[PDB]
Amino acid sequence: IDAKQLNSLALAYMGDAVYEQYIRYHLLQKGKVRPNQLHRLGTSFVSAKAQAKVVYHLLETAFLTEEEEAVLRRGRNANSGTVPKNTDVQTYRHSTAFEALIGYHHLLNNRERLDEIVYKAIAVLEE
Numbered sequence: 093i094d095a096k097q098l099n100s101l102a103l104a105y106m107g108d109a110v111y112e113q114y115i116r117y118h119l120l121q122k123g124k125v126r127p128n129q130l131h132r133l134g135t136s137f138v139s140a141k142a143q144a145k146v147v148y149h150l151l152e153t154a155f156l157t158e159e160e161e162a163v164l165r166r167g168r169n170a171n172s173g174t175v176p177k178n179t180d181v182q183t184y185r186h187s188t189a190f191e192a193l194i195g196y197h198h199l200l201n202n203r204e205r206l207d208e209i210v211y212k213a214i215a216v217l218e219e
Contacts, residue, residue: 095199100167100192107195112138114210137217140179140187146213147186155212160193167192 095103115137119130136142147164150156156164167189175184190213197206 093199095196098199100169100188101172103163103193103195103199104167104188104191105195106198107191107193110198110206111143111191111194111210111213115214118214137214140176140183142187142217143190143213144183144186146216147190149216150209150212155209156193163193163196164189 112134115134116130118137119125119133125133151161151164168185169188171184171188175181193209194206197209
């Protein structure tokens with residue numbers, strides 16, 4: 093897989109699952125919640141609004157390199173062309189962009205940098 097050439101929807105497809113795996117592990121490690129609550133708790137980390145909030149934080153603080161910001165810019169984009177119902181389009185684009193960045197680093201095996209981004213996302217959302 094050539095991540096630098098892969099289209100953004102495919103990158104986001106990958107990163108969506110990668111981030112999900114980090115989040116679910118995080119939720120189980122914190123523990124102390126009944127399993128029926130896990131889905132709802134996960135939504136506060138993986139919804140469009142949550143992922144967009146992370147992107148705004150990352151862009152604002154210059155947390156990312158220029159290469160990573162180019163991944164995000166590309167990642168907004170072209171979405172399959174439909175938006176999930178009752179979802180704000182800009183929020184959805186920034187969400188999808190986050191997923192593209194996560195996918196990108198996963199497929200390039202940049203584990204350490206990916207840890208950094210994902211743990212930062214988690215800290216932002218929990219603050």
